[PDB]
Structures are given as C-alpha cells and as structure tokens.
Amino acid sequence: GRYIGPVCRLCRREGVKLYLKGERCYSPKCAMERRPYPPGQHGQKRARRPSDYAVRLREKQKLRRIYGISERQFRNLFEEASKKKGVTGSVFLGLLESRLDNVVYRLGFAVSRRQARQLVRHGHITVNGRRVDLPSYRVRPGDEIAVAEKSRNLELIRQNLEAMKGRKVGPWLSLDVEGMKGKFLRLPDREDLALPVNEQLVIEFYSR
Amino acid sequence: LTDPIADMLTRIRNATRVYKESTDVPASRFKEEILRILAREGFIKGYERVDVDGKPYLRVYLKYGPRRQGPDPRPEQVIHHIRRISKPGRRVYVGVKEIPRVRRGLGIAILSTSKGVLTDREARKLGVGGELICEVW
C-alpha cells in the first residue's frame, strides 16, 4: 500500500518541514527543528552538488511523499493532467488535492492525511450523505462531505473539530462546523497553496 | 537548364549574400507573377522588365537591412532564407488543410493555384492549395 513507515526521515532528507503527523510537527520536538540534516550515517557530512536529475527527483518525492501516494497513483494523475487540457501543472495539482483523504484533512478533520485516510478508509466519513471508505475518491465541486453520523459520537473528531471552529479554511472550502459537514467548493490554483514545491521540476522529471 | 524557378530563387539568394543593388534573370510571366508577390510582401524592392543584348530579363531590385556596428557591420538580410520546395524531381502538392505556415507566421510559401499565385495566407483566405513553389524569409 502507501508508505506507512518512519516519516520524519522524509522531512529530514528533504531539508523541509512536512507536517506529516499533526501537532509535533509544530512542537520544538521536531527533527528538522532538532536535526534538520539528512537521516542515516552521513547526514552531518557536507552535501555535494546534486544532479539536475537528482533535483527533479526531489520536488517529486517531496510532493509525492507529502500525500503518501504510490508512485503509480502519481503517474496516472499526471498522465491524467498531462493528457488533460491547459496547464498540466495546475490541473494535476487540483487533481491531487481533489482526493478525499486530503480534503478531509484539508477540512481539518484530522492532523494528518494519514489520519484522513484511516478515517476515510474506515468510512467514518460521508459525501452527499453517501459513505465512502475510498481514500482515492476524486471529489469534484458540489460535493457535500459529512462525518459519519454513526461516528459523530467520537471524541477524536471533536478534539480536531474543536480546534477548528473558526480556523481559516481554504478559499475552495467551507466548514459548517458542529454539523461536522464541510463542503468542497471549486478546484484551486497554484497560488491557492504555496507548497514547498516547484511543480514544473516534476514536469521536467517525467519528461525523461 | 532544369528548373528556372529555383534558378530564379537561386540567383536572388546568390546576390543577397553579396549585397547587390540589383540582379538579372531570364523572363517568364510565371517568374514575374512570383516576383509580384515578393515585393507586395516586401522581400524585394520590385522588378522592371529590362532587356539584355536582345534578350528579355527581370533585373530585380534588392532590399537589405541596415548597417551595423560590431565587427561584422554587414546589413542583415531581408530574405534570411529562400529555398525551393516542389521540384521536377519531386512535385509537391498540398490541400488547403495541409498548407504550412512558414516560421510560425514570419515567412511565407508561394503557391501556384487555379486562382493565381498566392501566399500561405492568401490561399487559406481563398480556401485553396496547389504546387508549393517555395518557402522564404
């Protein structure tokens, strides 16, 4: 399946902060906050000139690892968007964010997509009323996403819920809080999320 | 001689490199009809039907770019390029849909047609095609 292994090693090797769990990634107990150098026996050694390839290799994994998606699942969409109209970048981006799990986390239902998926994969979520244990469902504009009424009685949801009431949600997002029923408004533009990514670099990558 | 057209074109391309105020060619209504295009688009200055020791000609009056500094001050060419397309060795024929657009729109291709010589654009406007005479810029 997805990754599911040691994760901090991601942020480190990348040299950037990926808030892959939730709270700690903000805490001063973080790795990059403590050890922002490569994992393994050779982290603190002077890095050397990465290759033009190696570079383009990064941005990918960085993004790819950000959502924890199989390489394949990350070819399709970018074969999707690339064969999709207009600027392949924005589309693929919107194609990625359009995943349930993500949006679920983007809707502050869980600190990590990792949680998002599980709650998603555990069907605790719903959409337009319908229940969806499908962490790969490409949610489209006009979709009503509702927590499982059967799981509205859970406390974790509310602890993440509570820490959301008036929290700032994406322009292409709402969050009728309490009702545990958000909503997915539109497809974003690059300027809608300033990810630590240079998407074109990933374009250059599969251009091989 | 095989193809006067390329020869015509060739004569031009041969002088433009040496920067001739003009040059000559044996005459033919077709060669002229061509040349007709080649000033209305602005690559030449125009032609006049001259006449050499008894024989007709077409002294073409040549247009070039401005003097320049650097070490190579020689004036850039108007007709950067001019090469034959359809030939006696390989006659080349196009339908209106398959009519190329020279150098993204900066050049043209002279076309012989049932409705007179045209440019890559004039044909598409008139909705026809024909024997691609040449492409030039």
């Binding site: - | 500094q69 650097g70 070490p71 001050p73 020689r74």
Partner: protein, 231 residues
C-alpha cells in the same frame, strides 16, 4: 571649408592592387592607375565632417593613426593642434582591446617623468640611470601622444586602414566610431566615416588632416588660419 581644388593634391593613385569594394568610389584609371571620383569624395567629406565637428562640439576624443614614413610626421602636427591622442610609431596591439593594461604602461612613463624630474636619489648606480633614461626614451618614443588618452576614445582617425586593419579591428569591436581616409587598396565597409583619398601624398594627407583639425578648433574653441606645411 571643404574646398574643392584638392584635385591638384592627391586625386588618387595605386595600380590594380585595388579592392573590388572600392569601385563605387572610382570613376576610372586613364593612366594605368585608378581614379577617385572627387565628387563623392566631397559627399563623404560632406558626410564625414558632419560627424567630426559633432563629436568636437560634444567634448569627445579622437585618436589619430598613421605609421607610414610618409605620414610618419604629419601625425604629430594636426593632432597636437587638436591636442588629442595620437599614435605615430608602431601600433601596439591591444592598444584599445586591452586598454586597462596598456594604459598601465604609462604610469611607468609618468612615474619616470617624476623620478627623472630629478632628485629622489640620483644616488642610484649609474647603470640604473642611462638604462632607465633609455627605458624612458623608448616609452616616450611610442607613448608621447597616446599618454594623452586617459579613457576610451569616442572615435579615431586613420591614414591607411589596410595598413591599420590592426587598429581598425580593435575599435570595430569596441563600438568606437572609426573615421579615416583611404585609397583604392583599403576595404571601405570596414570604415565608419570615409575620406576616400590618397594615403601617401602628405600634401594630400596634410590637406585632410589639417582641415579636419580646423573643424576641431572651429568647434573646439576659437579659430586659427595657417598650420605647418613642408612643401
């Protein structure tokens, strides 16, 4: 001031050692030697000078370039009239393309001017006198009136461009307008402002060079009439 009577001073020469690019500036060659169409000769004069004065009334510099034994001497005249840089002897390569380092060879000269200006130890072993003094007379031979050029010229002037294609080359690269006189043999095109006339008849050399300077002073502050002139 262009006169016109010049016809009795140079009116061209040089055999079939000509240059094909020069024919538009020739009417014939009745004496087995090309003939310069003094008409267009004016037309360039009427065009070239229009460039000269302009630089003058603008404050730019002009560098004179003439190394023939013919024009060996006239150079130091009309130049020093105009009081501007000049290159009488050898044309030191890179004299423009490599200015920053050429020029740095004049401080050595000016410096020797300081020292040899006197004391600061004449207690230097006699071997060191004569030798520098010699090292000075050389530095002086070549640099005398290019020591004047403390920055890159806004243009230059040339007697024999084919002779000074070296000179001609470095400017053409540096975008320094190049004006000069030439006869048959030289390559026009290579010139920026042209005085197609004889390049060995001092008599004709002085004519141009002299009058050229006149439009310097005539635009460079004041006026004067006669100048030197060996018969």
């Amino acid at each position: 001031v262009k006169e016109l009577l010049e016809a009795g001073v140079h009116f061209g020469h040089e055999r079939k050692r000509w240059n094909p690019k020069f024919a538009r500036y020739i009417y014939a060659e009745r004496n087995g030697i090309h003939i310069i169409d003094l008409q267009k000769t004016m037309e360039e004069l009427e065009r070239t000078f229009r460039f000269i004065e302009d630089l003058a009334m603008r404050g730019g510099t002009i560098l004179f370039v003439g190394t023939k034994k013919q024009a060996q001497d006239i150079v130091r005249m009309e130049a020093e009239r105009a009081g501007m840089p000049y290159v009488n002897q050898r044309w030191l390569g890179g004299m423009l393309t490599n200015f920053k380092t050429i020029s740095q060879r004049v401080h050595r000269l000016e410096e020797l001017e300081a020292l040899f200006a006197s004391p600061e130890i004449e207690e230097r072993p006699k071997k060191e006198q004569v030798r520098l003094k010699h090292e000075l007379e050389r530095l002086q031979k070549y640099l005398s009136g290019f020591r004047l050029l403390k920055r890159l010229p806004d243009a230059i002037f040339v007697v024999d461009p084919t002779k000074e294609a070296i000179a001609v080359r470095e400017a053409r690269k540096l975008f320094i307008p190049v004006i000069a006189l030439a006869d048959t043999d030289s390559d026009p095109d290579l010139v920026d402002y042209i005085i197609p006339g004889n390049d060995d008849a001092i008599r004709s050399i002085q004519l141009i060079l002299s009058r050229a300077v006149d439009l310097i002073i005539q635009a460079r502050g004041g006026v004067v009439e006669p100048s030197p002139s060996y018969a």
